[PDB]
Amino acid sequence: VNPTVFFDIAVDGEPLGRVSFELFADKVPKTAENFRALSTGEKGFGYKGSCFHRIIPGFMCQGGDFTRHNGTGGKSIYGEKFEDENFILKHTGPGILSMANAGPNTNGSQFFICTAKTEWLDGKHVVFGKVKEGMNIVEAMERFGSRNGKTSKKITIADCGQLE
Amino acid sequence: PIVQNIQGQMVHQAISPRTLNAWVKVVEEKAFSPEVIPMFSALSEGATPQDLNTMLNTVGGHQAAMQMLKETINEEAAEWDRVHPVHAGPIAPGQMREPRGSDIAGTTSTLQEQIGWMTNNPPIPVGEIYKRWIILGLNKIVRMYSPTSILDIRQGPKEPFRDYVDRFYKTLRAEQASQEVKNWMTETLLVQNANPDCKTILKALGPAATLEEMMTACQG
Amino acid sequence: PIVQNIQGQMVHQAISPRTLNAWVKVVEEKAFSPEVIPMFSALSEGATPQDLNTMLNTVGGHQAAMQMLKETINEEAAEWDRVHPVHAGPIAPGQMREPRGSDIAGTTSTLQEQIGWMTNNPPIPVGEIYKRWIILGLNKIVRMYSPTSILDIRQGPKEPFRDYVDRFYKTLRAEQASQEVKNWMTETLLVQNANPDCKTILKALGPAATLEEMMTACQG
Amino acid sequence: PIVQNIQGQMVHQAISPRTLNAWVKVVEEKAFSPEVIPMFSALSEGATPQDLNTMLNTVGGHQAAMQMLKETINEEAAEWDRVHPVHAGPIAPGQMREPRGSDIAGTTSTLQEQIGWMTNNPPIPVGEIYKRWIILGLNKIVRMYSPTSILDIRQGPKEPFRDYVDRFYKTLRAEQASQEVKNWMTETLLVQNANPDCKTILKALGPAATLEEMMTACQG
Amino acid sequence: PIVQNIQGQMVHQAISPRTLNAWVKVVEEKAFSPEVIPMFSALSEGATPQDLNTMLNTVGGHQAAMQMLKETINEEAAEWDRVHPVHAGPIAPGQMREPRGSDIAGTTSTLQEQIGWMTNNPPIPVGEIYKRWIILGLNKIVRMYSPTSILDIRQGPKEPFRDYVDRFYKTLRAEQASQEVKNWMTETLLVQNANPDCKTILKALGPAATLEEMMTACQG
Amino acid sequence: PIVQNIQGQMVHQAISPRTLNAWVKVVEEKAFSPEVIPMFSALSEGATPQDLNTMLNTVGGHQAAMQMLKETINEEAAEWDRVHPVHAGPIAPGQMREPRGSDIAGTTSTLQEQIGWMTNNPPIPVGEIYKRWIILGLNKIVRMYSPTSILDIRQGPKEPFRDYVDRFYKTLRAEQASQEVKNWMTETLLVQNANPDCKTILKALGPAATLEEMMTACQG
Numbered sequence A: 001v002n003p004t005v006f007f008d009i010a011v012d013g014e015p016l017g018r019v020s021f022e023l024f025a026d027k028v029p030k031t032a033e034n035f036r037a038l039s040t041g042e043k044g045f046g047y048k049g050s051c052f053h054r055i056i057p058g059f060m061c062q063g064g065d066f067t068r069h070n071g072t073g074g075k076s077i078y079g080e081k082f083e084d085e086n087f088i089l090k091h092t093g094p095g096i097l098s099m100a101n102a103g104p105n106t107n108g109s110q111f112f113i114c115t116a117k118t119e120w121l122d123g124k125h126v127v128f129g130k131v132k133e134g135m136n137i138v139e140a141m142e143r144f145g146s147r148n149g150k151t152s153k154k155i156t157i158a159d160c161g162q163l164e
Numbered sequence B, C, D, E, F: 001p002i003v004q005n006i007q008g009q010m011v012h013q014a015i016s017p018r019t020l021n022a023w024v025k026v027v028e029e030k031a032f033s034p035e036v037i038p039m040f041s042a043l044s045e046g047a048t049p050q051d052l053n054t055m056l057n058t059v060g061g062h063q064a065a066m067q068m069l070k071e072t073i074n075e076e077a078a079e080w081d082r083v084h085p086v087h088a089g090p091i092a093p094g095q096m097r098e099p100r101g102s103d104i105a106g107t108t109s110t111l112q113e114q115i116g117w118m119t120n121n122p123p124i125p126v127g128e129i130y131k132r133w134i135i136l137g138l139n140k141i142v143r144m145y146s147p148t149s150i151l152d153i154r155q156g157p158k159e160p161f162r163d164y165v166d167r168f169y170k171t172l173r174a175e176q177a178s179q180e181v182k183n184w185m186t187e188t189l190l191v192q193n194a195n196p197d198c199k200t201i202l203k204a205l206g207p208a209a210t211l212e213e214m215m216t217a218c219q220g
Helices: A029-040 A135-142 B017-029 B037-043 B049-057 B063-083 B111-118 B126-144 B161-175 B180-192 B196-203 B211-218 C017-030 C036-043 C049-057 C063-083 C111-119 C126-144 C161-174 C179-188 C196-205 C211-217 D017-030 D036-043 D049-057 D063-083 D111-119 D126-144 D161-174 D179-192 D196-205 D211-217 E017-030 E034-043 E049-057 E063-083 E111-118 E126-144 E161-173 E180-192 E196-203 E211-218 F017-026 F036-043 F049-057 F063-083 F111-119 F126-144 F161-174 F179-189 F196-205 F211-217
Strands: A004-011 A014-023 A054-056 A060-063 A096-099 A111-114 A127-133 A155-162 D002-004 D010-012
Touching: A004 A029, A004 A135, A014 A029, A014 A135, A029 A127, A029 A155, A060 A135, A060 A155, B017 B037, B017 B049, B017 C017, B017 D017, B017 D036, B037 B126, B037 C017, B037 C049, B049 B063, B049 B111, B049 B126, B049 D036, B063 B126, B063 D161, B063 D211, B111 B126, B126 B161, B126 D211, B161 B180, B161 B211, B161 C063, B180 B196, B180 E180, B196 B211, B211 C063, B211 C126, C017 C036, C017 C049, C036 C126, C049 C111, C049 C126, C063 C126, C111 C126, C161 C179, C161 C211, C196 C211, D010 D111, D017 D036, D017 D049, D036 D126, D049 D111, D049 D126, D063 D126, D111 D126, D161 D179, D161 D211, D179 D196, D196 D211, E017 E034, E017 E049, E017 F017, E034 E126, E034 F017, E034 F049, E049 E063, E049 E111, E049 E126, E063 E126, E111 E126, E161 E180, E161 E211, E161 F063, E196 E211, E211 F063, E211 F126, F017 F036, F017 F049, F036 F126, F049 F111, F049 F126, F063 F126, F111 F126, F161 F179, F161 F211, F196 F211
Parallel strands: none
Antiparallel strands: A004 A014, A004 A155, A014 A127, A054 A060, A060 A111, A096 A111, A096 A127, D002 D010
16 A cells, blocks of 8 residues: 655665665655655656755755756656645654655655654655665765765665565 | 557557548547547557657648647757756666657657657656647647637627527637636626626526526526 | 456556547537437446546537536535545554545546556445436536427427427436426326327327327327 | 567568558548658558558559659669669678668569568668658659749738638648758748738737737737 | 733733724725725734724724624634534643634633633634634725726726726725736736727737836827 | 844834834825835834835835836846745754745745844845835836926926926936936036026036036026
């Protein structure tokens, strides 16, 4: 019933590990379909070969800008941006997958994986999934980031797709 | 157009002459009215960009509308190329190079490459993108063919209410400015331009009146 | 529409262009007759809501009737939401999707969601519900398109009983009422509005006589 | 044609009686209008030179046009044979010999040799070259059937701008000039040959004139 | 109205007299105009429902408009009660019960309860809700006090374009039917009702013309 | 507007009703003149964007000018967005995000966000930027409200030099041009458009004569 997608992560081309995500399509369906479809690449464009452009140790890893590769771009499967579906789920801990945005109703394709409890984000970013397998791969990724987000090595989504 | 097999896989299939004949006949007989976009979307489901270029080049006459559609497709392809720059260098063995706007249009690419794009893993929907572009162009064309504006509608003293509302909703579907603006128009302009007798018969029912009672009031 | 595929696994098969052409032709040739309802119900057996939306968009002309159809679909969806709201209850062990008024009408429901709701066990009858709504709308439309009331049906001085009863039963079928009202009307109105020359003949047969007896009586 | 079997080897298939009947019908019905070349390129897809020669021979009448097409094919074959040397002598097994111009024309070869040349690795597009030659010939024919020239089009005082631009684009499609010269023509002569009223209208419109805004300005 | 202190907390404060005096003066001197809603929203920032009932009851004269506002507030209160139903069962220790539709207006609740509702944890914005309701009522009032409709605007032969566009935008801001419909109106109705000379001067610039050049064209 | 509060901690103080009444009075009597821009800048010192929106909404009448101001604010916002791109992503806990092009105009930015952007270290000059935009709009409006051009200013036969120079300098200040152009405009237009006797009187003083000497020449 709820889809599961994976990401095979790479640090400058060396394979690092697989993170897999359960998308809560039963509560945030339109948000979950957009991450699912961008992971499969079935609509022609997507996450494969994009990188995490902003990694802040102890906060979150952000990625998903496949058009401009630096947080200023990305687009959804419904157009460039769409509404905040709802705020049922909250940022309760590491592994929560939440939507990045540029204020309300500006969701595109950027997402962030929390590596800590970030309750201040509640009510401001739609949560739509959580890490299933691979959280120590997300944790190891932190080491390649910095206080301001700049990463030291290129961290890419080498491959991604749907598992179930 | 691609078609699935018994085991589930799909492979290219030659375009049926019946589809082309029906498309040309409906274009000739029904000209450019709001009911060509649904039939176009139904006729060419899963059609390759070559098949869509066929269905467009085959339309004899109304060359101005086809030129408008070509210009719209050109602008959409330019915007697609601007929003999705293609990478240079060697391409991976398990991946085929991503198409450009002029190649999404299918103008400078072979049919085998379109089939490889459409049956790749994951599949790339070039046909659906070019169909969306053609549908937008056809929407602009049916906007251009619109004979009269929405505001100039005024019922004659003898023209029945049925013909009035028919003409109104015809040019309203041909307008396609928006949805909520259309909803406001069908509330205000529909009752604002009635013949005085039937006009006050409709005002007797108030703004809460629906279309059915609106018509059976002036009926008989 | 989905169809049983060998073996025992329903897969989605897009609507065929020939079906759409048949629908466009029957709406062009027959306008809005009482019989179209059965032709529509038979042309779209087991159709996904997207197919019914396609078949309602491919219509040419009669935009007023299509607007009444859309508004009645909205009303049925509104009433359906009112009759089927989520009351608090313990959550089911097994979760199955659920169709909203807008999920049934195929407006905001993707094709995959409808395929799921149809092929899942137990199935959700979204297609039959939307077909019932469209059939109610078509009944409204065909009862509106009635040119004259059933009460005004009267035979001419030399108009044969054949054409008289044909037109009378056609208008009665287009008319809307309960079956008992029709049973009373066929006994109170048919014999009275006949031509006096054959009215005497029908009266000589009897009040509770059947249609064939009167028809062979005034035959010739 | 050569239909590609699903997940299997491509199998040769005789041209369909339906395809040949549609071809002869469109020839007989529409004579040689500019769309017969797109419709021919649509009907004949992946077809062998034998199939193309059959599709050409089934045409009845217009024997002058047929002889001109055969002369064009002969000239193309002569040019090909002149700019491509032909090897001879013993040929290694599993490798077909050098295709001559008379063989790519299909006048001195057989279906076995054609299928062999179309299945080789790498493939040799004998069908795609013979179709290109046939399209060049059909272009010459449709240029010969052009009733009036493009430089001699003048809008009538009562003939509307829509009809004028329709005729202008039809003659432009029939025209033989290169695409680079074809653009300047539709940029200049379209507004330079119209009636004085809408001519001054488009002059006030000024540069960057597109067909949509031109037609919206010349309304009424 | 509540006011923040040095420590950061807020507590009730008596309503200032020269606020009531200014409101009564602006209501009487300017009567009802689109620029009474911003003044009202600025005068009573953070005011309790008692303060808003004061500012409304204090308006002498124009009692029909005040009754319209009371009726609008009445209907709005009923909708709030219908949309959310109070929950049953035990209440959490850190939370206490909410107000009703009529108590949002402050008609049947003391000032201390309003202050507790506004400074609770988390705070409940009863003042902002009642201010939104009053602003909607004032919008309906200024709609009623509109002296003409948007369609009846036609500039006189001598009335300058400045006065015409001023009247147009005045009754357009007083219309408030929608925002995109306003955007369509300012394109169509603004250009459709000009005096013939300046009308064709505006038509010389096409639909791409902006308002500044639109006015400096007819200027001088 | 925020104000330095004892001691050294800026807190938000809502706009006073007396300031709004002064603004309404100056936009009731002075209406639109060159002096309004300076008065507006002094009445709204350090005002949050919400206060400037409140001061622009309270203006009754002159809806065309307010629409010009809103459109120029939108244009400046678009230019600020094109020059200062805003990167998306999670914000830092200590510092606030960079305001977008519409966060300056107070459309989608809550009052707390503006207070943060102003009181933060380093401060974000949102208030001064929005004031610059409104001042550009007001300059546009006051240059539009000019009744006649500066080239049309001419002295009457017996109209004293006082009124002539007053009206000329008033129209020149209302006019929009660079100060460098005005330096030539005065020395070319002031003496030429005067009365012939006073023209010779000023020419007797010299071309580069100051304003006071030119005045005391024809004094009385």
